[PDB]
């Protein structure tokens, strides 16, 4: 509905603030499921 | 001590904000943690 709305390879604002949570979580499950 | 207060669950969006990737995980863990 809004005019002038722009586009790029814009990441969601949701993930970069919570990178230290979800990225560490995914890395921990990947390390646990690797062997 | 507050007067005129009614009973209902609290309402302002922080729970779906940071737990966007976790509320679905909470629903999945409802069959794991609770029983
Ligand atoms: C700004 O970006 C959003 C998200 O990338 C765009 O939403 C996209 O909307 C189109 C149509 O509603 C969806 O299909 C696309 O159609 C165009 C034209 O047929 C085509 O060139 C694309 O390859 C694609 O098939 C598209 O799936 C949807 N994007 C996502 C991720 O779901 C929005 O249109 C963009 N706006 C402008 C002004 O660039
Ligand atoms: C919303 O919460 C209030 C307060 O818990 C409910 O009021 C009911 O009536 C009185 C207070 O107005 C409560 O009695 C007191 O409660 C304490 C526990 O906090 C208990 O140790 C004593 O029995 C004391 O007399 C009463 O327990 C409380 N009812 C319940 C079920 O907690 C009100 O009913 C609640 N509203 C809804 C829709 O749940
Ligand atoms: C509002 O005023 C009326 C006037 O009698 C009173 O009965 C009522 O208890 C008041 N409301 C509250 C929440 O105290």
Swiss-Prot record, chains A, B:
Superkingdom field: Viruses
Residues with glycosylation annotation: 7, 31
Function, in words: Subunit of the fusion protein that is processed upon entry into the host cell. Mediates fusion of the virion and cellular membranes by functioning as a class I viral fusion protein. Contains a viral fusion peptide that is unmasked after S2 cleavage. This cleavage can occur at the cell membrane by host TMPRSS2 or during endocytosis by host CSTL. In either case, this triggers an extensive and irreversible conformational change that leads to fusion of the viral envelope with the cellular cytoplasmic membrane, releasing viral genomic RNA into the host cell cytoplasm.
UniProt protein name: Spike protein S2'
UniProt source species: Severe acute respiratory syndrome coronavirus 2
Lineage: Viruses, Riboviria, Orthornavirae, Pisuviricota, Pisoniviricetes
Full-sequence range covered: 1128 to 1162 of 1273
């Amino acid at each position: 509905v809004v005019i002038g709305i722009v586009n790029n390879t814009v990441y969601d604002p949701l993930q970069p603030e919570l990178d230290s949570f979800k990225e560490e979580l995914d890395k921990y499950f990947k390390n646990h499921t690797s062997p």
